Symmetry: D2
Subunit: 326 residues, 4 copies
């Protein structure tokens, strides 16, 4: 009954935490738009998404209050009613707090936690390994998705880390970034379903068609048809050997993303991860992500425009692929 790596296939969409209009103000106390939360979930299920992730960086795990988090997760779990797997996010400044939060949110009904590492003090390899072992020991029923983001969490999630995570049965998946070492990490970590970012799924699926069956998406929050079409066409390509349509969709996605990162730079992107993702979603018009909670509520205008252009581009793909789905 605890999720397994084998159960993780297809399109895994990361949803934001919708905010109320006053959410940028430090005086506000209940800034989660719970009805927009429910609406997003039902829409994602209806689109055919395989699983839902949440409460990473752009999902504002860092900036929600604890009451906000419990209300958000409660609404998601009530809406899903067990139809698709759901991961909350419980990254925090220390092990004991992560355990506390993970227990409560799993109890409310999440299947797992998408989890980075404590980042006030930069972790080394043995520290990070111990940290995930501790969480899995404390909350054995929780599945774990490693949130392998070095910009946010400082630690760089190196090859030997993956070898160690593959020994922890609760660690079933990873929100993975660049795929330069995917070939080796798959070999080191046979028990983990590695999720590339949607734009890299095409390449990664070609490297290892047996293992690479799933990906994570934030572009889906601008309209999920694109990600659904990618998933479907890659399944087809694996069967027929004809990768041309999968390549065409993947190239479209890359172009849609081409203006997102300020000056092409993930490090500059990472300073504005929240505002840029939420602005992109706002601009696409598929969902209302809303204002960013403090302190990350200021984004330079030219960067915002890049994100908004990207949101329009993904909306255009959603309309194109909605028709191709029929």
């Amino acid at each position: 009954s605890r999720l397994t790596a084998e159960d993780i296939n297809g399109a895994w969409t990361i949803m934001p935490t919708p905010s109320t209009p006053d959410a940028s103000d430090w005086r506000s106390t209940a800034t989660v738009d719970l009805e927009e939360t429910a609406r997003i979930v039902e829409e994602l299920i209806a689109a055919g998404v395989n699983g839902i992730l949440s409460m990473g960086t752009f999902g504002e795990c860092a900036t929600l209050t604890w009451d906000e988090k419990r209300d958000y997760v409660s609404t998601i779990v009530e809406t899903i009613r067990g139809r698709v797997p759901y991961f909350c996010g419980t990254t925090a400044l220390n092990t004991r707090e992560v355990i506390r939060q993970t227990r409560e949110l799993i109890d409310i009904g999440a299947n797992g936690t998408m989890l980075g590492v404590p980042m006030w003090v930069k972790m080394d390899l043995p520290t990070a390994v111990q940290f995930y072992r501790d969480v899995a020991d404390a909350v054995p029923e929780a599945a774990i998705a490693i949130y392998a983001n070095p910009e946010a969490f400082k630690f760089d999630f190196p090859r030997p880390f993956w070898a160690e995570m593959s020994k922890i049965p609760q660690v079933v998946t990873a929100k993975y970034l660049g795929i330069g070492m995917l070939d080796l990490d798959l070999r080191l970590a046979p028990n983990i379903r590695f999720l590339p970012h949607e734009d890299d799924y095409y390449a990664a699926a070609r490297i290892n068609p047996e293992r690479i069956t799933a990906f994570w998406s934030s572009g889906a929050m601008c309209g999920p048809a694109t990600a659904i079409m990618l998933r479907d066409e890659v399944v087809r390509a694996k069967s027929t050997g004809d990768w041309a349509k999968a390549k065409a969709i993947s190239d479209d996605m890359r172009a849609a993303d081409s203006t997102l990162f300020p000056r092409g730079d993930f490090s500059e992107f990472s300073k504005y991860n929240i505002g840029l993702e939420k602005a992109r979603m706002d601009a696409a018009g598929w969902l209302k992500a809303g204002p960013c909670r403090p302190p990350y509520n200021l984004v330079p205008e030219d960067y915002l425009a890049g994100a908004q252009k990207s949101g329009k581009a993904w909306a255009a793909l959603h309309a194109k692929y909605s028709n191709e789905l029929k």
Copy 2:
């Protein structure tokens, strides 16, 4: 009335948060040794310290539970009974949590908060400036000490930031690191008492003897007589023009610190800031800092040994200077 920069003078000692023997275990609750806490406070006051700071990096602001912090601050306040100023620490992942914590700990009776910036997402200049404005607006009774540590908080606390902080009345001081730009920062920020690290106090006090009248010390947790002697001798040097004795103390301090940083690297020290400072204090034998709360409870044995040697060296200074004091 709220502490002013003018009132910040002399030796400001940063105390750890003493641990019980089980504190490394994620299963433990109530890991603060509150009696050792009280005993340290009384010893610091008896030594003649001007002010007490706490709950920075090595003070485990990151890894204490909220109940632990409340108990710790309560014990400190009851012990001090208003005789020296006291800063708690309330750095957290977002502005609302910082505000919440700061209000409570000030209400218990701390005079101010030693505060870095939220660090899951790296802050830019306008974000950092607005964050400190927000806290000051929200808790106008709290004095603020800027905890200007780029390794921990990613933000690098640049020149223009200091100019902005000088416009916020609550910002009375800074826990400052390298003094390469202290001359300019002093000009940009006339209203802030900049605290160099104890080892840099000699140089900084010669640069600007009118403004640089105070320093921060962790070495005092290995025996405060060194820091007290430095303070007293600098006051004398500023009056006589004879800096020989102040220089010799300051040079002893740098030597005592020479084995602390792994391979002389601040970045490598920063990965083990908690464990190395605590291990040094344990080794010096002036107080019992105790085990590190999870996750930061693993330190390479070579690095520990440098820390221990530094601890013994500072204990030797304390012995030497205790005799010169009386």
Copy 3:
């Protein structure tokens, strides 16, 4: 007539610059073992290598004198006698010096230059683009291989740079590092043959089997049979669709490389790239790389041991795959 991208296929092996016994001494003036140079070239040709690169970082382009370089290239050119393509390396501190060297080495009979960028001052995108345009304009008959090493050259060779290089006809190939963005770079640069590192060839050829027909090898300097076997088996996998044997070879290569990098870290490897590669080659016993020219003649002993072990592992692969080719 100048090489084209279409003409670049199979195993492209990077040769060191063999040194005399006294080569680590600044007093020495003629440190290239020209007979070992000739021997290595004929052995690489006999093994069936497709082309030869030289005079990158471990090839000691930085530390050879000009007379040494000319003598080295003269010996290579006269040994090859037009049988396989050959690239010299002409990276230098400024455009004029690069041009002067490129003209003379091409005149002697190299087909092209493996070229990084001037690195005293870190280059930006338009500066780097102009640099390569200037070299191609000055020496129109030289093929260029982009040496895309950010550690050495500071510049990071971003996506827009590849789009620009594809417009320069002389730019036919790239010595490329991590393949995270290879899918996109191939799309942005249709006219370049991108050479992944031998360990990444498997994944890269699976990503794009039409475009990725070639790779670069330094492991071949420990015995080229492994690289020739990889090449041949990838050709067969592309035709049959059965990748298992190519995968086995590739996995073997990565295991042989697993001790090369100090602490698994490319940046720490990059500080000792010369001494580590040359020590690895010396240990494998296929060729005599010899001492490193000053200043890069000092390598920590444990790092050396890692490289020697890698050399032994690669030698063992060469003996294994020698038999499978016979």
Copy 4:
């Protein structure tokens, strides 16, 4: 002339550019050094009372000059100075043998020393860097050495233990030093070296250690040297009287003049455009003609150039003000 000592290095040490002809950005050009402007600059600096001349670091285009250009430039400087003030050439190169070759030649022409960074294609570690400088000093025992301690250019960060090692090499008499955060300690570790802070840090550094910190390096002097001369003179008087206010005010003026030089206030971004920004500043100040940048470093974003030009104008304004205070 016996080799320079640290004790002989005092006052304002000005770093000169390598003046360029109008066609100097074109890779096709040879002889891009304006040798008459070179001579003129030297005589103007001597007339202003500078204590020593440095050259051929980063903005001095050590990386982008040809060898023939360097020889002509150094020959012109040496015949112009005619022994009146000490002079350092620059011989940083990609390897030890090339450094040695260039250093022997330029010393032989008549420079007193070399301002020397480390080979930077491969990032050096501590023992590698120490042996490099030992090798140069062994090879060219009559050259004084100025350590050019620039981590951005040279990758190596010139750590504390390195300075303890350099202090054992008699040839190493000075350092072009950057931020002063560890100056107090470096002085203690390296008793035999005259550390030169940047002109803007001289005030602070001289107050930290007035016995040891008697000299600084200046690129601002290339915009009009009166400011550097006045700073020098006023710090000498401050050390004697204990009244630092006038020295403080000049220093504060200098920092203000520098406030727009670094793109976004960032040393690392300035470092990408070190040549073009320094040379543009000097061109804007109008005291000398630095001229175009040799390839490849001939492209600078417009916004950044503008900050450099504003800085040049501000330093020209300081020169005019302090020229009047000098009488």
